[PDB]
Amino acid sequence: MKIDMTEVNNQKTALANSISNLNGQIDTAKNSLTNLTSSSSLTGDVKTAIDAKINNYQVPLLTNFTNALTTLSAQYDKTIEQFQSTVSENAADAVIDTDYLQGLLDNYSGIETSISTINTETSTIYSSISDIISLTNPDSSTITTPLAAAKTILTDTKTNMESFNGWTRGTELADLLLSQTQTIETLIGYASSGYTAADAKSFYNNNEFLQGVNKIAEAIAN
């Protein structure tokens, strides 16, 4: 269990670059589909059904894929927010290894025993010659108080690391992609019949999937 915020922020930049490239290619695919609806090279009721199919599904499908990229980017930023809030670590290059913290913790017992044993021994030799010369044994709690506080930091950090490692995101992107898959599968089932088929035409003219994609995009704009 290890995390390097340097690598995480580098992946955030690489993710933004790939999202920028995909959004440009998606916009090109949107323009190509738009050119079909504005074309007069085909006419009739079959063109009315194709225009309804493109404007109510094909273009919204490309729009929702851009919304999926924006949602994936927002979830990556929120995952960084969740890490920097659960562990309390706002450093941009922070490196934390749970096994390395445990290795530092495995040496505390030997130091704690040495401090407690030597303190008992020195206190004995100081009290044995107290009638000859009274000498003060130094306070061992001056060492063990920050020693335990330092151990708490290693105790709390390792715990929050293991705690954050089990944190789960929401189903926002999973629900968006399931809506994409179900819509595409329905368009596949209608591809064997004609565009002017009663069941297929009624589906192409239904704008509920378009309104759903419009609502996801409008929420993203605020």
Binding site: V95, I96, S114, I129, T142, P146
Partner: protein, 138 residues
């Protein structure tokens, strides 16, 4: 003869008491020297253990590897480590100061034991002179 011998005999009796008192005080001082030698031996052993088992072991919980521990959590941890290491060094210095005080006390007691032996030798020689004068006076 009777007031002259009693005069020197009384002075010999006092020097005899001074000898026995000086020897007893020297025996008590020598007993304090022995107890401090024991304390110096055991304190030096615990000082060496404080260096190897406490001060020298601090580097094993430091975490100076930047490739495995870096950020604000290391900063908060390095602060408490510095306070722990500074306290362990201070407590060792305290033991070294007490060890010096014990050594200086041993030296002062050895000087006092020699003075008590010199006082006993003087009292014994005075007793022998007074005893000879008291014996010849009769």
């Amino acid at each position: 003869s009777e007031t002259s011998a009693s005069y020197y005999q009384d002075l010999a009796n006092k020097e005899s008491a001074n000898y026995n008192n000086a020897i007893s005080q020297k025996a008590a001082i020598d007993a304090q020297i022995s107890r401090l030698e024991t304390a110096k031996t055991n304190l030096s052993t615990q000082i060496n253990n404080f260096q190897t088992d406490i001060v020298d072991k601090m580097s094993d919980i430091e975490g100076e590897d930047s490739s495995q521990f870096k950020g604000d959590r290391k900063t908060k941890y390095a602060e408490q480590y510095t306070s722990t290491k500074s306290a362990a060094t201070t407590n060792k210095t305290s033991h070294d100061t007490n060890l010096t005080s014990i050594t200086n006390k041993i030296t002062e007691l050895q000087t006092q034991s020699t003075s008590l032996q010199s006082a006993a030798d003087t009292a014994y020689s005075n007793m022998l002179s007074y005893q000879a004068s008291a014996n010849a006076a009769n």
